[PDB]
Subunit: 252 residues, 4 copies
């Protein structure tokens, strides 16, 4: 039994009407008919601390960053979901700042599975739902899906479904009748079908890759110091792949 | 028996030394040990016409665009390869212009399989090898992999492997000793192992998605006209998702 | 007398050591020698509410979004600064989420000057300081500077200065000795000199553009409805600039 | 007397109808009324060699890259134009491959003015005209304008004007009636007015920045070697700005 987790990263608290929620409302029943259990979280309804602290930071400065919040609750849902769908409005040609905080904190997991020697989100599947007034879906898809791929998510074809109006200021999905927009509706159906299939596949046949084994082989064929000479005698910023400055010989 | 096709999109003809080729030289024997037959094409060595023509263009203007070239030969290799690896230098925070032409022409296939009702590059797998002097790998990964995902490629985790120096003008992979660069070497191993596994998986268990069926369902729940009113009384470009201008009623 | 405002958008509260602060520490005395008064704000030290509310949202949901915070104080500094420098670490190939919130709220100003009929941040100048462990400076520069340009900032050449290490996980500017990194140091000097000159220029000779006049002329040559027919009979997502579906005739 | 040069980077030869040309047709008379002499070049009509050669490449391989073509003619127009407007369709969420080749070759100028000690395209002004069927204008604006800023162009506010339809496959500007699209028409007017003003300003009051002087000061405060230790004992790719590996001591 697979679980999809859909994160609506709108900046507006429930029950304020969300343009992005309209795409989510299409995807949820399609996943259920795939036999996939689905949960929708509007992350901005939850207290997720944005500030950062670790042991290299100042202890007292980090007090707020270390406080109790709802991130462990959300992180556990992400860890248990086989399909993660970020459902984000577009803001500044990016995902929202709320999606941004979530991904920042998700990228703090410095663990390795057991057992498999894989990053903890390996064998999961990502899709995207995006809503903008005019522009930015493909740019946001590239950025978010690239980052989720680094975490261990696989991405099927046609995994990013979205609504946009024409060049202009709006209006959004609701006044623009996005729920009857053919292109968006077909993309959502593509996404659900492809993410569902890939998730079933990877649940049966997960990656067997041993990342520690890959890294040990890489260590045997690599140096543990990076060093290059720099031409400090020019204002030029033009790229020069060959500069013939000589190699750097490092101590001991 | 699976085939990987690696496209070196350097701007320099063979046998000029390519910085990017160094990453390719790591990946090729790793794929062979996976039991995967690999071919490397340096696309700039081949005559691929950049100009565009179709029936809406002017006939005589399109003569050069319609000429005989090596694109059918390259396209057939792409169609038969189960794994496509774009191996691109970074240029202007983008892939090279040679990669750009290839992807432009690849995006002209307006066909649907048989049979499966899928885009013709469905069930294939993409990875990336990238080389830059300082910056741009993740940006290029997002853009290229998003576009290949729209064509039907699936992307495993950690599918983009790359080399970059620090902020500066260079030098590149060769003078910078990228062949002994631990991070690049481990990323290449991650990519080969994950793309190989996903390609074997999809060869055994391809997507069953029927895109025509998805589109017919989308047609039943959608309009065949998009129409919104525009506020023509303001210089503002600030986004307004609600503008309360009223719906547009369309003829017949 | 011109003012530069430099916003350090690190996620860590003062006095935690910030890698990005090192670039700021170079820029501040260079601006002073230009005769420019400079202020550094670490925005995460201040209470800036992320949630959104306006009159189309639910009143009670918006209570937290409407609360008293430090945004008016920060916004007034931005309005009075002739040079805005966003000094951002790189996170997820983007600016930080803290920079993201600031820009989101900055993009909510729906006002027009007086008087000049220009957006309120017209005639100001933007630069960027960026710090990453390996990659993303140019991508972030494009996204942030494009967005600030839409708000009214002008951008001189070589306005984005940054530090990055090579492909890898780190370390950052401090352990990587970025303060003695020639390329970063020269870029910072370029940025300060060019932003200072452009700000002095625009203070003496501001844009005279009348955006209302531009919009009224655009209204006279434009429609107040956007409408196109859609081909609802295909799964294809391939772009077709000509589809010969016929024009849409709109009521009255 | 100032000159604007507008480069239509469509992939289709004249006289094939270009969607992007429609935006150019709006901008050209607006520049003339500003008293600015304007020239439109459709770059794909001209023979511009894409392959690269320099002295580090193989001599015989580089023969085609070194051949006589129309690039010197185009480069001289770029050097003499005070305003450069790239007018590009959107392809793969990027500018076209033809724009890409032009910018690649433009980025090969490794010269410094005289005299001013500035990059040769200093004191010029850039704007953008973009046309897409649905999505990508802001992403392309960020990438292209960032790159032109590195070359010496200044960018005024609201310098990128564009047309896009809603999410979908098309049609383009012509069938979509982009010539009567209010938002695009007002953005073009903004761009012309702001680029014209900034170009007049910089012709009267150019940057006085001495980039050689900036670089010499940067040399005095910097090292001529970049060197960091690498942790070769982990598969992790999570970013760690502090790794406490110790500094690298370099020979002599
Ligand atoms: C600060 C800001 C920036 C925006 N940037 C963009 C953009 O870069 N591209 C777009 O197509 N739309 C945009 N929009 C508009 C749009 O994305 C957003 O209003 C809409 O999708 C909201 O969906 P939601 O109800 O929250 O679920 C921006 C809106 C704002 C402020 O609310
Ligand atoms: C026109 C141009 C733009 C470049 N832009 C970039 C860039 O935006 N980011 C980088 O890290 N390196 C870059 N580089 C340098 C770098 O990518 C490239 O030289 C190197 O990888 C070549 O590899 P190759 O031998 O062809 O296989 C740019 C180089 C040029 C000209 O050759
Ligand atoms: C969640 C996350 C994402 C990061 N993404 C990136 C990235 O995409 N590209 C980079 O070069 N460095 C990156 N880094 C590392 C880097 O930008 C950042 O640690 C460093 O500049 C901090 O500067 P600061 O002390 O806050 O002023 C990411 C770091 C984190 C977590 O702290
Ligand atoms: C290969 C390809 C990729 C495209 N990618 C995009 C895209 O990523 N975003 C868009 O809005 N439109 C796009 N389009 C469509 C669009 O940009 C283009 O057809 C239109 O502007 C042409 O203008 P022109 O007549 O040449 O001056 C892509 C079109 C093609 C093939 O012709």
């Amino acid at each position: 039994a697979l679980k999809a987790l859909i994160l609506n990263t709108t900046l507006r608290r429930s029950p304020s009407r969300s343009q992005t929620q309209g795409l989510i409302d299409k995807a949820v029943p399609l996943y259920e008919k795939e036999g996939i259990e689905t949960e929708v979280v509007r992350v901005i309804d939850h207290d997720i601390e944005q500030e950062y602290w670790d042991d290299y930071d100042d202890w007292n400065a980090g007090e707020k960053a270390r406080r109790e919040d709802e991130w462990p609750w959300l992180l556990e849902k992400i860890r248990e979901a086989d399909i993660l769908v970020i459902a984000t409005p577009i803001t500044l040609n990016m995902c929202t700042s709320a999606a941004h905080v979530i991904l920042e904190k998700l990228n703090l997991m410095d663990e390795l599975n057991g057992d498999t020697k894989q990053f903890p989100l390996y064998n999961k599947v990502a899709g995207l739902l995006m809503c903008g007034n005019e522009d930015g879906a493909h740019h946001v898809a590239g950025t978010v899906l690239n980052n989720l791929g680094r975490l261990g998510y696989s991405v099927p074809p046609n995994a990013a479904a979205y609504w946009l109006g024409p060049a202009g200021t709006g209006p959004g999905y609701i006044e623009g009748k996005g729920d009857r927009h053919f292109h968006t509706n077909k993309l959502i159906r593509f996404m659900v079908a492809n993410t569902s299939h890939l998730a079933r596949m990877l649940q049966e046949t997960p990656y067997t890759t041993d990342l520690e084994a890959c890294a040990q082989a890489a260590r045997e064929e690599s140096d543990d110091v990076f060093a290059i000479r720099v031409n400090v005698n020019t204002p030029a910023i033009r790229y020069k792949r060959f500069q013939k400055l000589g190699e750097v010989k490092v101590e001991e």
